[PDB]
Structure formats: C-alpha cells, structure tokens
Design a protein around this ligand. Structure first.
Ligand code: HEC
Ligand code: HEC
Ligand code: HEC
Ligand code: HEC
Ligand code: HEC
Ligand code: HEC
Ligand code: HEC
Ligand code: HEC
Ligand code: HEC
Ligand code: HEC
Ligand code: HEC
Ligand code: HEC
Ligand code: HEC
Ligand code: HEC
Ligand SMILES: [Ca+2]
Ligand SMILES: [Ca+2]
Lengths: 520, 520, 71, 75
C-alpha cells in the first residue's frame, strides 16, 4: 500500500509545483501516487537533482481515482477497421500510390483506429522501422488494454542487438524519427528538451537513434497530455503547438484575436541547472480544440529539402519539428516561410509537400467552430445517465456511435437518421471531388514521362512542376484530413476544385508541348 | 376558409373542362380548391382570357383531401445516399471521367435520391447552373418537405441581380436549359407551349434564359403530372412523351401493337386565342409504365450536333426536346433518324451519344413487362393493412424496402432473402460486365493519343471513332439505366458484350496501326 | 361517380344548415357526399318533408377525403 | 390544460410530411414520444413508464385491499 510523503519538503525546492498543486483540485493528492523520490530527497540540492526520482507515466496512475475516464479511454472501437490501407479503391485515396510516389507513405498508410493503439501502431506500420517491430503474434492486435499497459508487453523486436534503422522486409521504409513519438506518447516528457533541441539534460533529442528511443517508450496518449498532474487544470504539453501558439505569437485561434485572448495559453518553463529545459502550455479554459491540436494537425516531423536551393534539411534543424498552424489556403505561404518541402515526386520530379491529418486547422472558421463548438462536443461528449454522476466520455470516436449526445442535443430538429444523412451528403460530395482530383492529378503525372521522352523542354516541365505543387496540396489536404469534408465542407469544395483546375492547366500545358514536339 | 364558386359560370366558356370535370371523380370538387378566378370571370370573354386567374400548382392543393398519398410521396428515403458521385470506384461508373470526357456530366453526376428533392437537386448539381444555386446551408439537404413546399424556401442564388448562365465556381458547368425542367416540375404547365416551341401565349420556351425560368419554379413532381385535376383520371403531361407516342404514332408500347391499343393515349389540346397551345395525354388505363416514362427515359434536352455535317443543333431546334422512344438496339437508328449526336469525346474526338436513365425503354420486352407487370407494382405498390382502407403508396423507391408487397405476393415460392439474392445475381453480373466494358473503352481511349502522336492516319482514327460510338452506346446505356440490369438482364448482357467487342476491335485496329507506323 | 347537387336550392329551405355549411371548412363539400335527396327535392316544400332523403352514417363517407384519420 | 387527446390521440410526428391527428385512441404506452416525452423532456421512455407503473401498482394494491374488506363484510 502507498505511504504518503511530506510534500512540504518537496515544495522547499519546487516552488512552481507548490504554486500549481496547492491551488488546484489535486491539492489533496499526495506525490507518492506518481513519484518515488526517497533517494532524490536525500541527495538533491536546491539547484542539482541528485539521484533522479522515479516518475510514473502509466495511465493506471490516474485510473486508481478516475476509473470511468480511464475505462472509457481504453475501450476499443471494433468498428474502426484495423490495418486498412488507404491506397485502395474502397478507402480514402484510390490513386494514392501514383500520387505519392517518392514518399515513404507509399509503403503503407492505414486509416486510424482507436487511441489505445497509437504507439504500437506507430511502431509496427511498414513505413516506420523497416519492419523491425511486430506484435508478438497476430492475436495481439485486439489487445487495447495490453497496448496501454505498455507497447513492449505486446510487441517484439527482430534484432534487440542492433539499434540502426534498417529494412527487415523488402517493402518497408524507415521514416520514423524521434519527433514522431511526441504525437504517440509523452513517456519522454522529462527526457526531451523543448522542440527536441540538443540539451545537456536531455537523454533524447531530434537527432537520437530512434530505435533506441522507441525501446524506452511504453504508453499511448498519456492522461497528463491534457491535464496538468499537479493542478489538474487543462493544458497542452506538445512543444510544436506551444511554439506556434506562444513563441510565434499566432494564438490559439489565428483567425480570431478575441477568441485567442479569451481561450489562450500560458507557457510555463521548467529548468535544469537553471537553464530552460521543457515547457507546458496552461489553457485558460478546458478547450478541447487546442488539446486535440497537440496531434491532429499538419506538421513537419521529418527531414526534407529547401524550396530555395534544394538542399537537405535534416533532423538537426528546428524545422524538423514544426507546426505550420495554417489552413489549406495559408499553407503554401507557411511552407515558404520556413523554406521547406517534403519530397520530390518519383515520376514528375516536382518538389511537393506532404500533408498530414490537419483537423484542427480545417475546423477553424467552420460554422461549428464559429459557434463555439469544439472537438469534444462531437467526439468525447458528456455521458447521459438516468441516475448517475456525469463524467466526460474519453472514448474519442466518431459521433455516429453517440448521436444523441454528439449531435441531437444541439440539433433537436433532426432524428438520428436525418443527422447521419447530412453527414453523408457532405462526405459523399467531398469524396467525389477527391476522386476527381486524383483522376486529374494522375492524368497530369502520366504525361510527364511522355513529355520528357518527346523532348519537351525543362522550362515547360518546371512550369508543370510548379502547378503540381498546388494540384497536390489542394487535393492531399483532404485525403489527409479525416472528416472527408465534414469539418469544413465549403473549404474542402473550394480547395478540391482548385486542385482540379491546377491539374487541368498542367495537362493542357503538357499535351500542347508534346504535340508541338511531335509536330516538329 | 374556402368559399365555393359557381362552376356553371366557368363551364360557359370552358367546355373541355366541363366535359372532364362533370364525368370524373372530381365532379364534386369545386374550382376554388385550385383556382382564384374572380377577376378573370369579370374580364374574360369567350375567346380572350382577360385577367389571368391564379392556379395553384403546389402539392398541398391535393394533400387536403389526399393526405395519405401526399405523405407517402414526400417521405425521404435516408438509405438512398445523397450527393453520391457515380464516377467513383464504389459507385456505378468507376471510369466515367475518362469515358465521358468532353461532356458536362464530367463536372458531377450523382446517384438519384428521393423524388421530393428533384427540383432542388437539379438546381444545385455542379453541372447545371455554374454553382449559382446552393441550399441555404448544408443542413437543408435533409428537408424533403421544405423542398416540396418550394425550392426557393430552401435555396439561395449567388447573384439575384444577373440572369446569365455563368460559372461561380471553377469546376462547374452550365448545362441546364429550359427543357430540363419538364422532368423536374410542371409548375410551368400553363406558361410553356407544347414542346417548348415559341408561342405568343408562352412566357417560357426552349430559348428562354434558364436562370430566369428557374426562379419562377418551385415544386417537384406535381401530383397532376399523372392525374388530371379535372377528371381525376390517369394521364401524362410531358410533351416529349406525347410527341413520341401520339404525334409520331409509335404507340405506348412500340414493340406491341395490341398492348398499345389496349393501353393507349389520347392527346387533348388546349388553345390560346384559338391556336393550339398545350397538350395532355389521357391514358386508357392507370398505366404506370407510361406515367413514369414522362421522365425515366433517354432523351434529348440539350444542344448538340448533326451526324451528317457536324453543325450545331441549338435549343431553338425541336430536336433539343426529344424522346427517342427506342431501346438500346434501336437507339443508333433513332439518333440517325434525327441526324443528331451529343458531344465529341475530348481525347478520341469521336462523335458520341449521351445516354440518360432509359428505364422505360429497357423494361420493354422484359419478362415482367411481357407478363403485364408495371413500374408501380415494384416501386409504388398498394399498401397492405390488417384493418384499413387500402391506398397506393406514393413513395417511389426500391422494392427492397417493401418486398412483401413488391415481389413476394407474386413470387410465393420465395422468401425475402431468396428474392433479394435473385436481384443481386443480376446486378452483380451486369455490373461486372459494365466494369469490363469500361476497362476496354479506357484501353481504346488511351490508344488515341499514342496513335495520333505516332502518325496513324485520320482514316484509321476515323474508323476507330466509328467503333467508339457503338462501344460507348452499348456501355453507357447501362450506367445510365438505374436497375443495374434488373429491368432486362438478357438485354444488358447482350449489349455489354457488344460494347466490349467493339472496343476490342478498335484496340486491335489502333495497336496494329501504331506498330506499323513505328516499323516504318 | 358522385354528381353534385344544387346546394343553394337546399338552402332555400335549410337556413340552419346554410348558416353552418357556408362558414366552415366544409363550405366546398357538396351535399351528395352524405345525402341522397333527389326524390326529397322533387316532393318537399319548406313546410312538408315529402320523401325522406337518405343520410349516410357510414364512416367511409368521411374516409373518402380523410383517409389518414379513418385508417 | 392537458386533455385526453394529448395522451391518447396525439399529433403524428413526421420527418417529412403533413401533420395530422392520430385517431387511434389507445394507451400512450404505444406512442410515448408523442404522448408523454414531448412534455416530460426530463424522462426517458423507461422512466415515464416507471412513473405510470408506480401509480397503477399502488392503486391496484388498494383496490385489492378494498375488495378484501368488502368481501369480509359481505360474508
Ligand atoms: C533539496 C531540494 C529538492 C527537494 C527537497 C526535492 N527536489 Fe525534486 N528536484 C530538485 C532539483 C534541483 C531538480 C532538477 C530540476 C530543477 O532544477 O528544478 C529536481 C527534479 C525533480 C523531478 C524531475 C525529475 C526528472 O526526471 O527530470 C521530480 C519529479 C521531482 N524533483 C520530484 C520531487 C519530489 C516528489 C520531492 C518530494 C518527495 C522532491 N522532488 C524534493 C530538488 C529538490
Ligand atoms: C488519489 C486520487 C487521485 C489521483 C491518483 C488522480 N486524481 Fe485527478 N482528481 C482527484 C480528485 C479528488 C479530484 C477533484 C474532484 C472534484 O472535486 O471534482 C480530481 C480532479 C481531477 C480533474 C478535474 C480538474 C478540474 O479542475 O476540473 C482532472 C482533469 C484530473 N483529476 C485528472 C487526473 C489525472 C490526469 C491523473 C493522473 C495523472 C489524476 N487525476 C490522478 C483525485 C485523483
Ligand atoms: C481448436 C483450436 C483453434 C481454433 C478452432 C481457432 N484457433 Fe486461432 N489459434 C489457436 C492456437 C492454439 C493459436 C496459436 C496460439 C499461440 O501460439 O499463441 C491460434 C492463433 C490464432 C491467430 C494468430 C495467427 C498468427 O498467424 O499469428 C489468430 C488471428 C487466430 N488464431 C484467430 C482465430 C480465428 C478468427 C478463429 C475462428 C475462424 C480461430 N482462430 C480458430 C487455436 C484455435
Ligand atoms: C503532430 C502529431 C503527429 C506526428 C508528429 C506524427 N503523427 Fe502519426 N498520427 C497522428 C494522428 C493525429 C494520427 C491519426 C489520424 C490519421 O492517421 O490520419 C496518426 C496516425 C498514425 C499512424 C496510424 C495510421 C497510419 O498512417 O497508418 C501511424 C502508423 C503513424 N501515425 C505513424 C507516424 C510516424 C511514423 C510519424 C513520424 C514520421 C508520425 N506518425 C508522426 C499525429 C502525428
Ligand atoms: C486529448 C486530451 C485529453 C486526454 C489525453 C485526457 N483527457 Fe480527461 N478530459 C478531457 C476533456 C476535454 C475533459 C472535459 C473538460 C470539460 O469539458 O470541462 C476531460 C475531463 C476529465 C476529468 C474531469 C471529470 C470529467 O469526466 O469531466 C477527469 C477526471 C479526466 N478528464 C481524467 C482523465 C484521465 C484519467 C485520462 C487518461 C485515461 C484523461 N483524462 C485523458 C481531455 C482529455
Ligand atoms: C460538430 C461536430 C464535430 C466537431 C466539433 C469535430 N468533429 Fe471530427 N468529425 C465529425 C464528423 C461528423 C466526422 C465524420 C464521422 C463519420 O462519418 O463517422 C468527423 C470525423 C473525425 C475524425 C475521423 C473519425 C473516424 O472514425 O473516421 C477525426 C480524427 C476527427 N473528426 C477529429 C476532430 C478534431 C481533432 C476536432 C477538433 C479540432 C473535430 N474532429 C471536431 C464531427 C465533428
Ligand atoms: C452544440 C451545438 C452543435 C453541435 C454539438 C452540433 N451542431 Fe451542427 N450546427 C450547430 C449550429 C449552431 C449550426 C449553424 C446553424 C445555422 O447557422 O443555421 C450547425 C450547423 C450544422 C451543419 C451545416 C454545416 C454547414 O457548413 O452549412 C450541419 C450539416 C450540422 N450542423 C450537422 C451536425 C452534426 C452531424 C452534428 C453531430 C456530429 C452536429 N451538427 C453537432 C450546432 C451544433
Ligand atoms: C367569359 C368566358 C370565361 C369564363 C366565364 C371563365 N373563363 Fe377561364 N378562360 C377563358 C378564356 C378565353 C381563357 C384562355 C384559354 C381559352 O381560350 O380557353 C381562360 C383561361 C383560363 C385558365 C388558364 C389560365 C392560364 O394561366 O393559362 C384557367 C385556369 C381558367 N380560365 C379558369 C376559369 C375558372 C375557374 C372559371 C370559373 C370561376 C373561369 N375560368 C371562367 C374564358 C372564360
Ligand atoms: C376537396 C377534396 C379533393 C381535392 C382538393 C382533390 N381531390 Fe382527388 N378526389 C377527391 C374525391 C372525393 C375523390 C373520389 C374518391 C372515390 O370515390 O374513390 C377523388 C379521387 C381522386 C383520384 C382517383 C380517381 C379515379 O378515377 O380513381 C385521384 C387520382 C385524385 N383524386 C387525385 C387528386 C389530385 C392529384 C389532386 C390535386 C390536383 C386532388 N385529387 C385533389 C377529392 C379531392
Ligand atoms: C426526360 C426527363 C429528364 C430530363 C429532360 C432531365 N432529367 Fe434530370 N433526371 C431525370 C430522371 C428520371 C432522374 C433520376 C434518374 C437518374 O438520375 O438516373 C434525373 C436526375 C437528375 C439529377 C440527379 C442525379 C444527378 O445526375 O446528379 C440531376 C442533378 C438532374 N437530373 C439534372 C438535370 C439537368 C441539368 C437536365 C437538363 C440538362 C435534366 N436533368 C434533364 C429525368 C430527366
Ligand atoms: C408518377 C405518376 C404519379 C404521381 C405524380 C402521383 N400519383 Fe397518385 N397514383 C399513381 C398511380 C400509379 C396510382 C395507382 C393507380 C392504380 O393502380 O389504379 C395512383 C393513385 C392515386 C390515387 C387513388 C387512390 C389510391 O391511393 O390508389 C390518389 C387519390 C392519388 N394517386 C393521389 C395523388 C397525389 C395527392 C399525388 C401528389 C402527392 C399523386 N397522386 C401523384 C401515380 C402517380
Ligand atoms: C418486377 C419489378 C420491377 C419493375 C416492374 C420495375 N422495376 Fe425498377 N427496379 C426493380 C429492382 C429489383 C431494382 C433494383 C433495386 C435495388 O437493387 O435496390 C430497380 C431499380 C430501379 C430504379 C433505381 C432504384 C434505386 O434506388 O437504385 C429506378 C429509378 C427504377 N427501377 C425505375 C423503374 C421504372 C421507371 C419502371 C417502369 C418502366 C420500373 N423500374 C419497373 C424492379 C422493378
Ligand atoms: C396525461 C396523459 C393522460 C391524459 C390527459 C388522459 N389519459 Fe387516459 N390514460 C393515461 C395513462 C398513462 C393510462 C394507463 C395506460 C397504460 O397503463 O397502458 C390511461 C388509461 C386510459 C384508458 C384505458 C387504456 C387501456 O388500454 O387500458 C382509457 C379508456 C382512458 N385512459 C381514457 C381517457 C380519457 C377519456 C381521458 C380524458 C377525460 C384521458 N384518458 C386522459 C394517460 C392519460
Ligand atoms: C371522439 C371524438 C372524435 C371522433 C369520433 C373523430 N375525431 Fe377527428 N378529431 C378529433 C380530435 C380531438 C381532433 C384534433 C382537434 C385538434 O386538436 O385541433 C380531430 C381532428 C380531425 C381532423 C382535422 C385534421 C387533423 O388530423 O388534425 C379531421 C379531418 C378529422 N378529425 C377527421 C375524422 C374522421 C374522418 C373521423 C372518423 C374516422 C374522426 N375524425 C372521428 C376527435 C374525433
Ligand atoms: Ca507535413
Ligand atoms: Ca440523351
């Protein structure tokens, strides 16, 4: 059984913790619930850590007093089909292989599934670690509780004796790097300096051997990613988000200065040896839009190249951990502002961006966002009980599973079937335009080899490559974004029509240039 | 409250109405239910209208005394997925964009949904009005009753101050013209001369500004499209159908003279200033096959070109409002008979037809049609009540929703699952041949640029273009037709195999010609 | 099929019904829906019924225009 | 101001249609959405049924006891 420790002794050296813990709703929660600091207290000074205390990062540290929230979190939605590749005719991007050729995502890009699996899924996807990690067997894919207990309870490593990123199977890639893990776990929260910069107190950084880092990480989506463990108040911990919102002054709602002020973020920095080390962002309100934006954003978390001169941008560069914090129509400017692109298309040679799940940036300016609705209202609502103490569901999932609570309480004019019909109208329309955009991108891409072989000039090919960047951006945003337009239907429509327009311009340019070469 | 008017006063000048009203089952229904004619009666003469009476065209004019039929009509089938683009891998025509390139349908062609939405869907589809009209917001897509009350109660116009057809968004088209509206509404029944010819008494015609016309129209599928309001007897009002059946003498069942005589149509013409103005077709029997054929047919409702010389055929030409009234194997001859084609393929340059929803012509000669079965038996059956007055369901929808009434009463040997299995056998087989036909069409189409660039002769290209017409026709009939072969499975099979044969002939011709150029 | 009768003629002797029928939502509903009064009209005066007209009491007399309520 | 029809012949609720008054005069148990929960938004169907049953059960118990005592007197 746990035995409490004297917090006042800790507070002597930990003023920031005292100021947070004594005021919030964890003022009665003893440190022993999460820390084993006996040897630390014996050896520390006011400025030197001495022996390092043990800090629990397992979600069960919270389950003890918050079982309802933990159990709701760890539930597996079996209807969220697992390991479902998006580059298939029946999923989100039928022509993805042709369009993304040159990028690691060609090796595998599955639809998301329940949060419990995020860290294990990161480890086992074919694009990440060369197939090094696997579930212990194919049965273990069901085990959400086991994944939560720890990745290494359910996974195996093909070669514990080496730590290099390499292929273990032919059709894999080694795209993973340390930055990725910030959106899968925060087990490393005390071992990683802000932004993953090099730091004498950091075990891990952007430039670490990712296989070694991986082995040190266990738990998905720690509860403390959204809730300060000391004050119990709302927060974010993701460095890239704090950097966008606070350091770069863009605000929590870049398009709305007032809402940004009302629903803001305060950066709190913790030091090691009186040098800034790590930071958190305390939220003015329990604003799920910003909490979920720790991960459900478009980002850089990878090496790339400069738009200006084509030179390599490696993991050592700050740009390798970056939140663009820009909607689809501001993205090109945001990529220009850091002089960055992700890859060269394998067929066209165009410099292209790689877009990833920009739900937060897409939601900005939508009718729901403008009306004060937030992700949690649709994806983790309060639970309705005939007789019971209400709590917030932590099963982050489609509203289709809880339409009473997610939609119909605010849309009293609709039945469940009507609300579902409205969702489907948007998704069906948007998906149709995604497919049309892919058709036209594919048509353009297929002309590049024909044009090169016909002797079309590099000047013309480069004009087409410039169009490819835009045709790509204004399409891929929407295969990346998980709502199939629901989050911002008018924006999706405008963007996808722009993609098609750009591809059609490139097709005409290339066809005319090929025909002129042939005629000559 | 309504106050009756003296019908005998009207009958003094309206002999045709007297002859219909006094004999049928509306003999006791006073004119005030549908007409406000006070000032008209004061000012008319036997030959001049004077002040124009108001005529109600809203469906609620009938709902008052026929609520069951109205409510069944306006029901929305939420399982009929809305705004679902057909040019996607999971819908009816995976390769539609490549095959239809050059035609407006490339901008958008969705699956049908419930009848309540026909007029609003016509107004808002991306191919029709350049994106000028939209629902007031994305919520309104659910509102079938509102659509029925009137399109302009649920839609907005991007520019009320102009009336030209233009693009408001990039990836739209302006294919709509006045003829289209005849299959969406008959609000214009008193304002449109037969066939849309120019007429001094007609406000609207084939050559009208369609945006202005659109603004004057409100209600979908008026109840009086199938039921004469004066006699209550069965009829059609669609000019193009009357023209095919009566003027051109083709009959209600062109393949069956006897059934045509037993189940015929009598053209009744109404005059303005003692000049023929409009017409209806009174049916000998309540024959849903002919009622539904007002709209569920292949038609011209658009400009096009002549097969003979390639010249433009505009909206002013009668051929712009035409029912071919021909099955798939008689269609080419029917298009030749009016010297007409719809578009030139964007890649192949072939003159091609555009086929649209030919359910009526497909049903001819099928086993069910030959056995006296009609559309209503499967799509709007009598309602079965343990205790109640029977009425006819007006919810025109798939029999899957009412298999007891639609199929199993006539197929006592089957369970519901067996009947569904039989439908699926046909649809699955037919769809497979549609996909194969598209594969071969696509293969042929892709050879055209290769052949042109290799220097293949125009003579060879023109031979391939002639094959393209047939390959196209014998495929597109079946993506246009909504039953996926169920209405006439053997015909679908024969046609689709013909399509593949034609495409294979073209592929061989082009490949051999390319190879010969290369060899030279 | 029903053939309407001249309600104004009935009202020459039926002021009580006139005052109800002409004001309410059945003002357009002809008497033939519920009465067979041909021989009555031929034989009545304002003070003598003559032949008794038939009045329908069956619910189907209403179902004809109000099927939803009937069913 | 509630009347028999509110519980026993309510207006029909239609996603798309012309409203009319149900003439099926029957227990509200068959149409609880339209003939109780429309007024009692604080309740689920099961809660509303439970409240009916509490009353009927209590009342019936007193009917049975009343009959017991009447019968004892009669005898
Ligand atoms: C003699 C002063 C002193 C006392 C007493 C003390 N600490 Fe610390 N502690 C430090 C210093 C110094 C650091 C390094 C960070 C800093 O400079 O604030 C540290 C770091 C930590 C960390 C971060 C460890 C890591 O992995 O980065 C935790 C957790 C912690 N202390 C918990 C506690 C707890 C719980 C108590 C009471 C049981 C306690 N400390 C008492 C001085 C103290
Ligand atoms: C020893 C029991 C205990 C432990 C362990 C514990 N909590 Fe709490 N927590 C509480 C109590 C007590 C409250 C206050 C309840 C109230 O008054 O509403 C609370 C409140 C909260 C609140 C609501 C705060 C607010 O201001 O509304 C959050 C969020 C929370 N805890 C999260 C967590 C997280 C995350 C963990 C794991 C890092 C955790 N708790 C661990 C007991 C515990
Ligand atoms: C009568 C025994 C038996 C039956 C029947 C059976 N399983 Fe298994 N299954 C096993 C055993 C034993 C293993 C291997 C256990 C281990 O090594 O951990 C296994 C392994 C598996 C695996 C892992 C496969 C792999 O390659 O790693 C899956 C998935 C699985 N079973 C699913 C199913 C499914 C689904 C069914 C029903 C279609 C089924 N099993 C029926 C006994 C059975
Ligand atoms: C800014 C936070 C963020 C970063 C950094 C991040 N991800 Fe993710 N990842 C997500 C979110 C959100 C999802 C779920 C939504 C989705 O997949 O579209 C996800 C899903 C996944 C999945 C499951 C779906 C799939 O694509 O197969 C895998 C595997 C994955 N990430 C791997 C990685 C890898 C490898 C990296 C680093 C190269 C990485 N992630 C970096 C946020 C992030
Ligand atoms: C992605 C951010 C996020 C994560 C991670 C998270 N929560 Fe929450 N949590 C929320 C939100 C949002 C609320 C509701 C705040 C509101 O509306 O006031 C909430 C509320 C709570 C509350 C307050 C009582 C309630 O139910 O409303 C507790 C306790 C809590 N969470 C515990 C946990 C536990 C334990 C975990 C880990 C199993 C967890 N949270 C993980 C977002 C998160
Ligand atoms: C007004 C309600 C609403 C809001 C607010 C909302 N979403 Fe969604 N979201 C939806 C709907 C509807 C879908 C489509 C779900 C479906 O079709 O099953 C969706 C889909 C998703 C999906 C994919 C779910 C799946 O299983 O396919 C993710 C991830 C997501 N949203 C994240 C977010 C984020 C993060 C936010 C806050 C920035 C957000 N959503 C805000 C309604 C909402
Ligand atoms: C707590 C409020 C709230 C919630 C939760 C909510 N809605 Fe809404 N929704 C609104 C409001 C307010 C509007 C805008 C109303 C208006 O302007 O007419 C709106 C707009 C919409 C629109 C129109 C969008 C557009 O771009 O025109 C759709 C569709 C919709 N909601 C569906 C849903 C669905 C489905 C859900 C459940 C996933 C949901 N809403 C949840 C309040 C809500
Ligand atoms: C003095 C003769 C006269 C009388 C009486 C008369 N009409 Fe007409 N009405 C006409 C003429 C003439 C036209 C033009 C068409 C025609 O020539 O038949 C016309 C046209 C109409 C139209 C078509 C209007 C349009 O928009 O095209 C309607 C409806 C109509 N009458 C209804 C009635 C009704 C109902 C009454 C009795 C209340 C009535 N009329 C009495 C002469 C008459
Ligand atoms: C004032 C009430 C009233 C109005 C308004 C009305 N009807 Fe009727 N309708 C009747 C009556 C009464 C009958 C005869 C019922 C019977 O005897 O079977 C009838 C019969 C019919 C029939 C059956 C005819 C047959 O020969 O079998 C049809 C079809 C019909 N109406 C359609 C309509 C249409 C369409 C409208 C709107 C243009 C309409 N009705 C408006 C009262 C009305
Ligand atoms: C001969 C009658 C007829 C004509 C004329 C007609 N349609 Fe249709 N329309 C139909 C039928 C029947 C359907 C439903 C069956 C289907 O879509 O296959 C339909 C469906 C539609 C739809 C919904 C499905 C889709 O394609 O997205 C739209 C939009 C539409 N029509 C627009 C038009 C336009 C624009 C015109 C004129 C260029 C037109 N229609 C002319 C009969 C017609
Ligand atoms: C597409 C043609 C069509 C349309 C439009 C149409 N009906 Fe019908 N209607 C039919 C058919 C078919 C029958 C059954 C005839 C038969 O089998 O005798 C029917 C029968 C009827 C009947 C006779 C009683 C019955 O139910 O059998 C009435 C009354 C009627 N319809 C009213 C209406 C009303 C009111 C509307 C507008 C809401 C409407 N109809 C629209 C085709 C149509
Ligand atoms: C013997 C029964 C039968 C007859 C008669 C019939 N159909 Fe069909 N129809 C079907 C079946 C079965 C389907 C496929 C429905 C499905 O798979 O859900 C279908 C599909 C349709 C569809 C598409 C429905 C949808 O939701 O996909 C339309 C439109 C249609 N038929 C119109 C007609 C027309 C118009 C007629 C008269 C010329 C007609 N049908 C006659 C059985 C019939
Ligand atoms: C506030 C709603 C309400 C009102 C108003 C109401 N009732 Fe009831 N009535 C009920 C309930 C509840 C029952 C018990 C039904 C059950 O248990 O299934 C009932 C039972 C009945 C029953 C027996 C039903 C059966 O199937 O056992 C009759 C008869 C009845 N009521 C008549 C009337 C009359 C007549 C009025 C108007 C003077 C009236 N009720 C007003 C709620 C109502
Ligand atoms: C026991 C009395 C009673 C009887 C008998 C009765 N109704 Fe009603 N009726 C009502 C009530 C109560 C209303 C609703 C009045 C209101 O709330 O405004 C109603 C309304 C109506 C309405 C108006 C439209 C509507 O639905 O609200 C019509 C039409 C009607 N009844 C027809 C009939 C028919 C036909 C019959 C015979 C089958 C019938 N009624 C028998 C009580 C009755
Ligand atoms: Ca990116
Ligand atoms: Ca056509």
């Amino acid at each position: 059984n746990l035995k409490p420790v004297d917090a006042m002794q800790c507070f002597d050296c930990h003023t920031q913790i005292e100021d947070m813990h004594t005021v919030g709703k964890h003022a009665t929660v003893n440190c022993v619930h999460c820390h084993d600091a006996t040897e630390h207290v014996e050896t520390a000074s006011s400025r030197r850590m001495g022996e390092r205390p043990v800090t629990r990062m397992d979600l069960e540290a919270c389950a003890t007093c918050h079982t309802a929230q933990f159990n709701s979190f760890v539930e597996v939605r079996h209807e969220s089909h697992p390991r479902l590749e998006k580059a298939t005719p029946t999923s989100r991007s039928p022509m993805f292989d042709k369009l993304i050729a040159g990028h690691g995502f060609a090796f595998e890009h599955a639809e998301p599934r329940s949060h419990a699996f995020m860290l294990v899924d990161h480890f086992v996807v074919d694009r990440a670690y060369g197939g090094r990690f696997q579930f212990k067997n194919w049965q273990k894919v069901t085990d959400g509780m086991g994944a939560v207990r720890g990745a290494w309870t359910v996974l195996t490593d093909a070669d514990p004796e080496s730590s290099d990123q390499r292929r273990f199977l032919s059709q894999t890639a080694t795209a993973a790097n340390p930055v990725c893990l910030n959106c899968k776990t925060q087990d490393h929260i005390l071992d990683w300096a802000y932004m993953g910069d090099e730091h004498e107190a950091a075990k891990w950084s952007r430039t670490s051997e990712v296989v070694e880092f991986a082995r040190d990480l266990n738990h998905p989506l720690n509860c403390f990613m959204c809730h300060d463990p000391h004050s119990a108040g709302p927060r974010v911990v993701r460095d890239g988000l704090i950097n966008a919102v606070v350091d770069r002054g863009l605000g929590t709602y870049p398009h709305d200065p007032v809402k940004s002020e009302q629903q803001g973020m305060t950066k709190v920095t913790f030091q090691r040896g009186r040098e800034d080390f790590r930071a958190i962002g305390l939220l003015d309100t329990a604003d799920s839009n910003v909490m979920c934006a720790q991960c459900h954003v478009e980002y850089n978390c990878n090496p790339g190249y400069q738009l200006s001169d084509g030179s390599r941008v490696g993991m050592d560069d700050r740009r390798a951990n970056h939140f663009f914090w820009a909607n689809v129509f501001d993205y090109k400017e945001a990529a220009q502002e850091i002089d960055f692109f992700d890859f060269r298309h394998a067929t066209t040679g165009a410099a292209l961006p790689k877009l990833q799940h920009p739900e937060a940036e897409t939601f900005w300016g939508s009718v729901h966002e403008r009306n004060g609705v937030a992700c949690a209202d649709c994806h983790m609502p309060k639970v309705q009980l005939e007789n019971g103490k209400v709590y917030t569901s932590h099963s982050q999932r489609t509203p289709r599973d809880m339409m009473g609570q997610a939609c119909l309480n605010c849309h009293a004019e609709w039945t469940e079937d009507q609300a579902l019909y409205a969702i489907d109208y948007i998704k069906n329309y948007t998906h149709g335009k995604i497919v049309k955009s892919e058709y036209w991108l594919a048509k353009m891409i297929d002309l590049f080899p024909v044009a090169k072989r016909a002797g079309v000039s590099e000047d013309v090919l480069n004009e087409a490559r410039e169009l490819h960047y835009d045709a790509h951006l204004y399409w891929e945003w929407w295969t990346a974004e998980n709502s199939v337009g629901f989050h911002n239907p008018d924006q999706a429509r405008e963007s996808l029509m722009t993609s098609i327009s750009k591809s059609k311009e490139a097709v005409s340019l290339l066809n005319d240039a090929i025909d002129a070469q042939v005629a000559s």
